[PDB]
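User: quick one, sequence for these tokens?
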């Protein structure tokens, strides 16, 4: 019976709705979501919402949904996004669905200026993005100004030929054509190989303060923590790889990163609300757990996947060549229907 609560879950490309009750856990809602869309590499994902206080977090899967301050509005809003990024997408993103999702989430972040991207890289990124949307460049169907309708570059990157958007749709095409002979999938994965190397890719930024009260930025990623200055979020002032951490903890707004190396100092910072601290150590344990995972041998589930992937691919290199030949003929056959009709137009 229990009062039902309306829930909207937006994925990168989809739009979902569900129903939950007071005793429903985050994990239970999560599994309904992944079940639906058909995702198996769940370990990189999570459900994100906004704080009553205005922050952005990930629903805890072990506790009840309505038990962790949600906006208290209806329906409830959650975004199904990538929460942990791998160290090598080429090696760790096994299935397409998983690739497409990272791809869309990252592109959105590259296009909205959430992730810094130098102009030349943005242009190159756009080409791969068009290559997977439009396919090989066709000098016949792709009538100049074909790109004129979609977001290809960050606003920052634009404006440099502003009111001259044609120059961009021009520089981009130069590369689009340079990609003839590459499937949507490879383009996507190549986009990611490029993005995956940007200085602020896959970095969770937290606003903090120095022991004296200096506004800094903490960052958590698959490699450790970093402290950035208030005017720069691209370059770390101090680093903290896992191997350089022997113990981290907090005490209501006070964080402590115990060095593992030649008894260096002891970095400490202070966060406004208490949750922020709880969250930071959560991301860390998460990222570190995954950091370790990649180091140990592949599990068993993975081995099955990586396998039903290579074979799944091969089954699409043949199908890709079967639909190719049964039309590479259709040409030689219609180049005849012509050769003849033409010769007998007398």
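Assistant:
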């Amino acid at each position: 019976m229990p009062k039902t609560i309306s829930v909207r879950v937006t994925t990168m490309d989809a739009e979902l709705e569900f129903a939950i009750q007071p005793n429903t856990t985050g994990k239970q809602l999560f599994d309904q979501v992944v079940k639906t869309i058909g995702l198996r590499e769940v370990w990189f994902f999570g459900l994100q919402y906004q704080d009553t206080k205005g922050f952005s977090t990930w629903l805890k899967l072990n506790k009840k949904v309505t038990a962790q301050d949600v906006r208290k509005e209806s329906p409830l809003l959650f975004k199904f996004r990538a929460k942990f990024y791998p160290e090598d997408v080429s090696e760790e993103l096994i299935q397409d669905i998983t690739q497409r999702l990272f791809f869309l989430q990252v592109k959105e972040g590259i296009l909205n200026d959430d992730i810094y991207c130098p102009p030349e890289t943005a242009v190159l990124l756009a080409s791969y993005a068009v290559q997977s949307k439009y396919g090989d460049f066709n000098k016949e169907v792709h009538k100049s100004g074909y790109l004129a309708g979609d977001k290809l570059l960050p606003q920052r990157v634009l404006e440099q030929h502003k009111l001259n958007k044609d120059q961009w749709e021009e520089r981009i095409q130069v590369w689009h054509e340079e990609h003839r002979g590459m499937l949507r999938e490879d383009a996507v994965l190549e986009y990611l190989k490029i993005a995956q190397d940007l200085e602020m890719y896959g970095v969770n930024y937290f606003s903090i303060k120095n022991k004296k009260g200096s506004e800094l930025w903490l960052g958590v990623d698959a490699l450790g923590l970093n402290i950035y200055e208030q005017n720069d979020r691209l370059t770390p002032k101090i680093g903290f790889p896992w191997s350089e951490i022997r113990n981290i903890s907090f005490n209501d707004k006070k964080f402590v990163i115990k060095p593992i190396d030649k008894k260096a100092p002891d970095f400490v910072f202070y966060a406004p609300r208490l949750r922020i601290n709880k969250r930071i150590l959560a991301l860390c344990m998460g990222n570190h757990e995954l950091y370790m995972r990649r180091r140990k041998p592949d599990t068993i589930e993975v081995q099955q996947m990586k396998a039903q992937a290579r074979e799944e691919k091969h089954q699409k290199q043949m199908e890709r060549a079967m639909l190719e030949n049964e039309k590479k003929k259709r040409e030689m056959a219609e180049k005849e229907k012509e050769k003849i009709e033409r010769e007998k137009e007398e």
